[PDB]
């Protein structure tokens, strides 16, 4: 189907404790594949998925130099923002940048993204047409006019429609044995005595990829939401994901309830009974 590549940059100032910490992570779909940490000893962009390890020294030098340069220009941007918002030099602040691209099943460009945030709040973003900017306030509007005059959007569009897409296709092909595979959820149920009058049925979905999944309960075929609890999807720590949904039922009525699991890796949805 469709795929995405995303890079997430974070700089965190720490006045009195040296230079800001910069971190970069890169993802393809729900799989992290690179990382950079300015506090780490390596000072290198590093592989975090096996299929990226085959890239040669040129790839690693270039990616390292580029994110290293970002850590350095981020320090300038932090100073600029502090001036824009008239903030003292004593406080700690954060800048975040997200960018990347989506392609369809045919590997062709679908859309591009570039957004920036200061202290967790939107600052500036490239519109979806990749030709103009939207600014969240007047400080950001200052950046917008500057980037308009300098035709910054054109540089981003060239990257997002060209370079970004070309690398994403390459990663998809090189990592196809995993990136283009689905791991269907492994499902089971547990039963827990709440009181003498009630019990909890918990329906589990484990070891699945990608993260997208839907877990629901039915009671004699009727959708149930009351007395249900659905936890947020969480990483197993091995590249796969976990989720569960539970329902409180009158003791003796367990048999009325069915758990339903929908996932990309399932040719048809699962129905689990206790």
């Amino acid at each position: 189907g469709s795929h995405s590549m995303r890079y997430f940059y974070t700089s965190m100032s720490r006045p009195g404790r040296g230079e800001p910490r910069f971190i970069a992570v890169g993802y393809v779909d729900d799989t992290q594949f690179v990382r950079f940490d300015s506090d780490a000893a390596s000072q290198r962009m590093e592989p975090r998925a096996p299929w990226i390890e085959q890239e040669g020294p040129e790839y690693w030098d270039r990616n390292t130099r580029n994110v290293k340069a970002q850590s350095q220009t981020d320090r300038v941007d932090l100073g600029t923002l502090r001036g824009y918002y008239n903030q003292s030099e004593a406080g700690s602040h954060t800048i975040q940048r997200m960018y990347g691209c989506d392609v369809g099943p045919d590997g062709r460009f679908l859309r591009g993204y570039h957004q920036y945030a200061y202290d967790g709040k939107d600052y500036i973003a490239l519109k979806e047409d990749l030709r103009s900017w939207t600014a969240a306030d007047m400080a950001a509007q200052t950046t917008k006019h500057k980037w308009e005059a300098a035709h910054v959007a054109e540089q981003w569009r060239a990257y997002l429609e060209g370079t970004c897409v070309e690398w994403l296709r390459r990663y998809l092909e090189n990592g196809k044995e995993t990136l283009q595979r689905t791991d269907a959820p492994k499902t089971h149920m547990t039963h827990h005595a709440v009181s003498d009058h009630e019990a909890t049925l918990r329906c589990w979905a484990l070891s699945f990829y990608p993260a997208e999944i839907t877990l629901t309960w039915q009671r004699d075929g009727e959708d149930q939401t009351q007395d249900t609890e659905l936890v947020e999807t969480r990483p197993a720590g091995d590249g796969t994901f976990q989720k569960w949904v539970a329902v409180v039922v009158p003791s003796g009525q367990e048999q009325r309830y069915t758990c339903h699991v929908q996932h990309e890796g399932l040719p048809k949805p699962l129905t689990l009974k206790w």
Binding site: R62, N66, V67, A69, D77, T80, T163, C164
Partner: peptide, 9 residues
Amino acid sequence: SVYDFFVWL
């Protein structure tokens, strides 16, 4: 692969 041009706020 990451972007490689220089732009400041």
